[PDB]
Design a binder for this molecule. Structure first.
Ligand SMILES: [Mg+2]
Ligand SMILES: [Mg+2]
Ligand SMILES: [Mg+2]
Ligand SMILES: [Mg+2]
Ligand SMILES: [Mg+2]
Ligand SMILES: [Mg+2]
Ligand SMILES: [Mg+2]
Ligand SMILES: [Mg+2]
Ligand SMILES: [Mg+2]
Ligand SMILES: [Mg+2]
Ligand SMILES: [Zn+2]
Lengths: 83, 128, 60, 98, 118, 204, 151
RNA sequence: GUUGGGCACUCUAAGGUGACUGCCGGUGACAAACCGGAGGAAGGUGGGGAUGACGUCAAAUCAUCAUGCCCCUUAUGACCUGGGCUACACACGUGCUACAAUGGACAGAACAAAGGGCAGCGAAACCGCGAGGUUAAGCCAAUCCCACAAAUCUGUUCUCAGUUCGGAUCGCAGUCUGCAACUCGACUGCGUGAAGCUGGAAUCGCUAGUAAUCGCGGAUCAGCAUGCCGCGGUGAAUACGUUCC
């Protein structure tokens, strides 16, 4: 858990893109590699396409998703049982 | 004063015993012995040289002991008393040596050795 | 190590946390001692030549 | 008071270099405390003996650092410049707390 | 005596007996009794109606039992609903906190179901 | 399975090559010395250098080189030695003073002896001859013992093996025995041969 | 070992009863080198003996040993393709050892909560010519006498 | 021990001394030696370490390094971001923690050794339930700091219960490092309170300051150790014997 004194982390590149869309009522798929970026309140409603390792997974943001890192919605491994 | 000095040593302990005349008061770093050494069994072992020489209630044993643990120090004091009684009366050598109270106990902690879990204890073997 | 990997370790990285030791003799990443800046293998060899001051085989 | 700390890996060259300083102090006329042996700093290095695997096969190396302390009570100007004259051997490190 | 809809052990001491309430452990049980001003050594059976009353009022402020169990349930439900990694670990019955799963995930997994080796 | 004979004896009867104390700078100096010893070995390859003691005091580096051919190292008065000095001052960035000593009997220095055998092996001499001859010359120089080993693809063989020859006493377990030891390699067309040489000069 | 018999290390007698025989017992009872705990139990257990009987605890304890300590024991012996538990005279040294071991072992298996009580109660049972450590000494004798044939 | 004062004592560590079957007796070729005895801190290579013959296994390592030959050379080379090396039906190896009363909880007394520390160790003080934070003394160290020993001892409470045992798992809220702890860090608080009642066939270590048990330090290292390498504390049992493995 990141320290409160530091405050919540986000990559400038990501935040700038979403803030740029928030200037208007524009909604586009923000493809990114910043899995470590926290989902800020002002992300809600966007479709951020998070890189899982080999592809950009589209992730529609909700209110409940605020607080969590973008990587939490783009699982890296592929498992579907043994046998 | 007519103090009889005798250094003693066990494990990491080092007793500086001094036999001043008195009535059998062992004093370990400005305390009674019972405060410092709680065990009854260890106190008897410290008396062991005094009891054989029959100088219990003759000297007050003044001690400056450091290092090791409670028993380590107990055994150090015993060695120091024994060596102090040689300065008091050299004829006590015969009776002290018989009991074996004039041996620096050379049992020390054996080193840990690489590959082994302890000094001797080897890791658990399996043929498979 | 590869020449590229030695070079890239010598270059200052993007962040100080990304900075790591190699053996200055042979470029080995693992088991590099800070006192000598040598890996365990190189340290052994040069210690035997008497080329690491004050270092001798220990026993106690 | 002047105070001298000597550090070296070999104790033979240390005591030689110590005796030079003791000798140099007496001829200069100042009072010598003498070479006090401070505790030896033993570092120890355990390494894997083999290049690959064989974890239980090690080798242990040590670096002992021997230390001597020479105090010089009641110096005289010649004594201070007499320590300049001793170009002590490489392997002995000197430190002056004058 | 019943406290927060739980008949706690009568024969035990109150610090201990209060921990039988879901949502109270030794520290919480200490800090209530302190606030009530009841001795920790007293048995539940040998409490007065005054003492029990004061204890009840304190515990009614604290989130315990179903109030707490519902909170915990919704927390875990939220994680599943959003489709978080932790939610996926919750539903699949695997470690949620990065514990390695090649060995020793038996608390989550349950007991072993052996399969034929090669 | 055998420990280095030099390694066993350092700080017992042998002494360190690098003869200096440091605390803060220890690693920096060590990698300076490595860079020196590397450079000296490359430049003075043909000049029969063995030991290269290094000493330090302030910004100064005293380098006692041991060589069987001191005239070859020095050259005309002091031409080549100064060219070396000025080249070391580029690497080190310090004052470099170079003493040069003589090995009287080069067949008692293990490192020289090992390099001789290695050079002969590169020039297509039989490993049997190369070794046997050195055994005699070392014994003539008054070594109390000598072992020499050559290991690898001997005579361009497919299967590698280690042939070795010995004379006198080489008591490797005896700690006070001054047993010099050295190794060398020869890049042949069938890869690497390796040489090893033990010389027992006597007791201490 | 192959070389021969080995110097058996001696224990000091003890700061109350002055008994080697009972210092041994502290060491049998001791766990993880915690000699203090075992001394404490012993001494507490001996108090409890003195209160219940009235007699000297040492005495009851030495009476108890006599009933626990065996004289004959069988020993496993492969001959051909069948085992013959062969009876052997127990050495004086080993008698004590088996005495104390069985006392301490069967003490720990009793249902009394504290060890000082378990030890005390077991010591009293041996003196009564019954209990578990006695039944063990009975059962070792039964096997020894059952295989009296062999020698 | 703080000061003055002394270096006595302990300690530190350089140089010596001491153990050699040397001496006594017996057995023994009158040999070698062995058995016991004296003196001695130590007795029979005192304890422990380093030290590893010729060779064996075409044993391990072309990924420390080096190297013959072979192969690739707008790619099998090189740069980047993200992911993976942490996957989980399951099987094995090595460990840690337990299953409790020789215990748990709580409280009060204690007694170590060996290490590490320069952008590093960081006291005290103050704040925070705590992890920690702010600030900052001293110390390039027998000077200061890491540092608090813990088992133990003495009280008090629990009274045999899947519990006041055990502490997995999970929820919530934090702390710290780091550009950044989703995948994938450690630690803290509060809540949660799993399996487990000493383990089938079988199987491992250890002969003494050993085993067993209790803490402490270090390398690597920003952070991360139940691992590894060291350190002391407490401290056993047993060895008849050589048949069998
Ligand atoms: Mg790093
Ligand atoms: Mg291992
Ligand atoms: Mg993990
Ligand atoms: Mg004798
Ligand atoms: Mg030998
Ligand atoms: Mg092979
Ligand atoms: Mg791996
Ligand atoms: Mg508990
Ligand atoms: Mg053995
Ligand atoms: Mg670390
Ligand atoms: Zn290297």
């Amino acid at each position: 858990a990141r320290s409160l004194k530091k405050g919540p982390f986000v990559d400038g590149h990501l935040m700038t893109k979403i803030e740029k869309l928030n200037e208007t009522d524009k909604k586009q798929v923000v493809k990114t590699w910043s899995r470590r970026s926290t989902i800020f309140p002002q992300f809600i409603g966007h479709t951020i396409a998070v890189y899982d390792g080999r592809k950009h997974v589209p992730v529609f943001i909700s209110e409940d998703m605020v607080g969590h890192k973008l990587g939490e919605f783009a699982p890296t491994r592929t498992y579907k049982g043994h046998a | 004063q007519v103090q009889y000095y005798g250094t003693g040593r066990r494990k990491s302990s080092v007793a500086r015993v001094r036999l001043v005349p008195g009535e059998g008061r062992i004093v370990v770093n400005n305390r009674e012995i019972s405060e410092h050494i709680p065990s009854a069994a260890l106190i008897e072992d410290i008396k062991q040289p005094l009891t054989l020489t029959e100088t219990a209630g003759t000297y007050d044993v003044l001690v400056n002991v450091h290092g090791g643990g409670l028993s380590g120090q107990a055994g150090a004091i015993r060695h120091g008393i024994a060596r102090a009684l040689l300065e008091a009366d050299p004829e006590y050598r015969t009776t002290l040596k018989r009991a074996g109270l004039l041996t620096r106990d050379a049992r020390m902690k054996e080193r840990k050795k690489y590959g082994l879990k302890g000094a001797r204890r080897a890791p658990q073997f399996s043929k498979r | 190590a590869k020449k590229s990997m030695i070079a890239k370790q010598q270059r200052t990285p993007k962040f100080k946390v990304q900075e790591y030791t190699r053996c200055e003799r042979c470029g080995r990443p693992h088991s590099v001692i800070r006192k000598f800046k040598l890996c365990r293998i190189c340290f052994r060899e040069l210690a035997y030549k008497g080329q690491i001051p004050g270092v001798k085989k220990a026993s106690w | 008071k002047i105070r001298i700390r000597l550090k070296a890996y070999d104790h033979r060259i240390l005591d030689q270099s110590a005796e030079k300083i003791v000798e140099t102090a007496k001829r200069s006329g100042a009072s010598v405390s003498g070479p006090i042996p401070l505790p030896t700093e033993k570092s120890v290095y355990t390494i894997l003996r083999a290049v690959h695997k064989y974890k239980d096969s090690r080798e242990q190396f040590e670096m002992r650092t021997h230390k001597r302390l020479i105090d010089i009570v009641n110096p005289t100007p010649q004594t201070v410049d007499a320590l300049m004259r001793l170009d002590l051997p490489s392997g002995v490190d000197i430190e002056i707390k004058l | 005596a019943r406290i927060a809809g739980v008949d706690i052990p009568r024969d035990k001491r109150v610090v201990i007996s209060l921990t039988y309430i879901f949502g109270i452990g030794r520290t919480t049980a200490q800090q209530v009794l302190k606030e009530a001003g009841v001795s920790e050594d007293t048995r539940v059976r040998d409490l007065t109606e005054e003492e029990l009353g004061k204890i009840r009022d304190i515990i009614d402020k604290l989130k315990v039992e179903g109030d707490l169990r519902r909170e915990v349930s919704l927390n875990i439900k939220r994680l599943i609903e959003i489709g978080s990694y932790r939610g996926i670990r919750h539903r699949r019955g695997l470690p949620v906190r990065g514990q390695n799963s090649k060995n020793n995930a038996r608390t989550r997994k349950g007991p072993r179901r052996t399969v034929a080796n090669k | 399975q055998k420990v280095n004979p030099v390694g066993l004896r350092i700080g017992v009867i042998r002494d360190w090559e690098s003869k200096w104390y440091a605390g803060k700078d220890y690693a920096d100096f060590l990698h300076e010395d490595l860079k020196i010893r590397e450079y000296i070995s490359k430049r003075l390859s043909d000049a029969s250098v063995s030991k290269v003691e290094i000493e330090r005091a302030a910004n100064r580096v005293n380098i006692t080189i041991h060589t069987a051919k001191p005239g070859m190292v020095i050259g005309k008065g002091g031409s080549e030695v100064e060219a070396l000095r000025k080249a070391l001052n580029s690497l080190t960035g310090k004052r470099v003073h170079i003493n040069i000593l003589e090995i009287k009997r080069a067949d008692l220095d293990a490192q020289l002896v090992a390099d001789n055998i290695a050079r002969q092996l590169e020039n297509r001499v039989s490993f049997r001859r190369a070794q046997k001859q050195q055994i005699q010359r070392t014994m003539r120089a008054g070594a109390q013992g000598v072992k020499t080993m050559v290991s690898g693809r001997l005579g361009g063989a497919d299967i590698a093996r280690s042939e070795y020859y010995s004379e006198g006493t080489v008591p490797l377990h005896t700690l006070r025995a001054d047993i010099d030891y050295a190794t060398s390699e020869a890049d042949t067309t069938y890869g690497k041969l390796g040489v090893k040489v033990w010389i027992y000069r006597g007791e201490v | 070992p192959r070389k021969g018999p080995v110097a058996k290390r001696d224990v000091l007698p003890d700061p109350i009863y002055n008994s080697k025989l009972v210092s041994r017992l502290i060491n049998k009872m001791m766990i993880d080198g915690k000699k203090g705990k075992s001394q404490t139990i012993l001494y507490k257990s001996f108090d409890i003996i003195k209160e219940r009987t009235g007699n000297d605890a040492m005495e009851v304890f030495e009476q108890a040993l006599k009933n626990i300590m065996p004289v004959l024991e069988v020993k496993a012996r492969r001959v051909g393709g069948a085992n013959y538990q062969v009876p052997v005279e127990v050495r004086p040294e080993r008698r004590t050892t088996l005495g104390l071991r069985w006392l301490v072992n069967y003490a720990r298996l009793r249902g009394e909560k504290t060890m000082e009580e378990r030890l005390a109660n077991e010591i009293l049972d041996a003196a009564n010519n019954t209990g578990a450590a006695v039944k063990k000494r009975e059962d070792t004798h039964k096997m020894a006498e059952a295989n009296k044939a062999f020698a």
